[PDB]
Structure formats: C-alpha cells, structure tokens
Amino acid sequence: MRVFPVTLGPLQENAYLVETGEGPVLIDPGDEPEKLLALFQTTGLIPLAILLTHAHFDHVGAVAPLVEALDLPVYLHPLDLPLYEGADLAARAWGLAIPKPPLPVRPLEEGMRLFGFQVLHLPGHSPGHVAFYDPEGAQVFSGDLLFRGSVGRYDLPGADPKALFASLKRLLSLPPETRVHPGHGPGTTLGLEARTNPFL
Ligand SMILES: [Zn+2]
Ligand SMILES: [Zn+2]
Ligand SMILES: [Zn+2]
Ligand SMILES: [Zn+2]
Ligand SMILES: [Zn+2]
Ligand SMILES: [Zn+2]
Ligand SMILES: [Zn+2]
Ligand SMILES: [Zn+2]
C-alpha cells in the first residue's frame, strides 16, 4: 500500500488516500473537497470507494461532492447511520457548513474484508466506529480511537466511555509495530503508545 494523508477542515481531521491491491480507496474525506480532488491529481490515484471509520461531521463533510463527481460507494458501519444522516445539522450547530452526506451507504461489519483491510468494530467514540486493519503492511486506520499521546473524546454524540476502553484494549493487542494512522494529529505506532500514552 501507498498512503497519502491530508489534513482537512477547521477540526484538522486526517483523510487517507490509500493504494490497495484492489485499487485506491479514500478514508474519511472530512472537508475541503478541492484539496482532495487536487490530491488525486498529484498522486495519479482515483479512489474506487469511500471508507468511513465513523460518521462524525468532521469525517464526512466532503463525501457529497465526491459522490456526485465520481459515483463513489460509501462504506459505513450501520450503527453510525444516525450520525451520518444528521451530520450537516451537527456541523450547523457549531456554525459550520457542510453538504448533507448522500444516501444510500454500503455496510461495514466486524470481520469484513474489503480492499485488503479487515474491519474491526471498535465502538466507544461513536457506536459504529471501526478500524481498517492491514496485517500484511502492519498498519491500521483507526479513526478517533487512538492518537499520538491521547485517545478519542468520549463526550461527543454516540459516545460510550466503557466501550471506548474495551475497544482500546482490543486495539492494543495487535502487533506493537503496527503503524497507526489516526483521525487527528500525527501518526504513531501501537508500541509507542503502549510506552507513552497517559490513557493506556
Ligand atoms: Zn504498504
Ligand atoms: Zn468545508
Ligand atoms: Zn469523531
Ligand atoms: Zn453520477
Ligand atoms: Zn477484497
Ligand atoms: Zn461490534
Ligand atoms: Zn454501551
Ligand atoms: Zn474526528
């Protein structure tokens, strides 16, 4: 896999354009569709699908224009559908404008394999929060579960603090060399966080 991260929107969310053995995918296009469209150009990669770790508005704000332009299927765990459906309203409450994310979506599920990833259902930050795990490349796109020196907020819509810490226990049982590509902030590894994260 070749991995192209881009930070997007006022909430500084990380999208990932990833070349897989089954073609390119785009993970969490949160905002600034022009910036994503420009990334397609400089990399020469056109995503075949949108994959969503979860449906907080900062992760889905660029879904609509990209689906309109490229007819991209959108993969989301069904437990985050209520978040997905009202994402523009949630953004609006903070005074932020995004287009309403388009329906329908294609489902994700614990144990599913797609585009070279294994889907881990890891709720807590949101009910349908997943990670996309690539054991062969030793890497995980774990959304807002685990950050460099912190963990996902558990005070947001759909949050479940006890689910979160159970999910983190699950995540930290993967190989320590596993590279983490999170929804916010810099990349890390599971081993580094095992040594330094104050929540672990
Ligand atoms: Zn790779
Ligand atoms: Zn925007
Ligand atoms: Zn989130
Ligand atoms: Zn179309
Ligand atoms: Zn496949
Ligand atoms: Zn589950
Ligand atoms: Zn619960
Ligand atoms: Zn986020």
TrEMBL record:
Residue ranges of domain Metallo-beta-lactamase in the record: 12-184
Residues that, per the record, bind Zn(2+) 3: E85
Binding annotation for Zn(2+) 5: H181
Residues that bind Fe(3+) 2: D58, H59, D144, H184
Positions bound to Zn(2+) 2: D58, H59, D144, H184
Domain of life assignment: Bacteria
Entry keyword set: Hydrolase, Metal-binding, Zinc
A family per Pfam: Lactamase_B
Residues binding Zn(2+) 4: H121
Binding site for Zn(2+) 1: H54, H56, H125, D144
Binding sites annotated in the UniProt record for Fe(3+) 1: H54, H56, H125, D144
Named cofactor requirement(s): Zn(2+)
Cited SUPFAM superfamilies: Metallo-hydrolase/oxidoreductase
Alphabetized GO MF terms: hydrolase activity; metal ion binding
Record has Hydrolase as a keyword: yes
Annotated InterPro entries: MBL_Glyoxalase_II, Metallo-B-lactamas, RibonucZ/Hydroxyglut_hydro
Record's protein name: Metallo-beta-lactamase superfamily protein
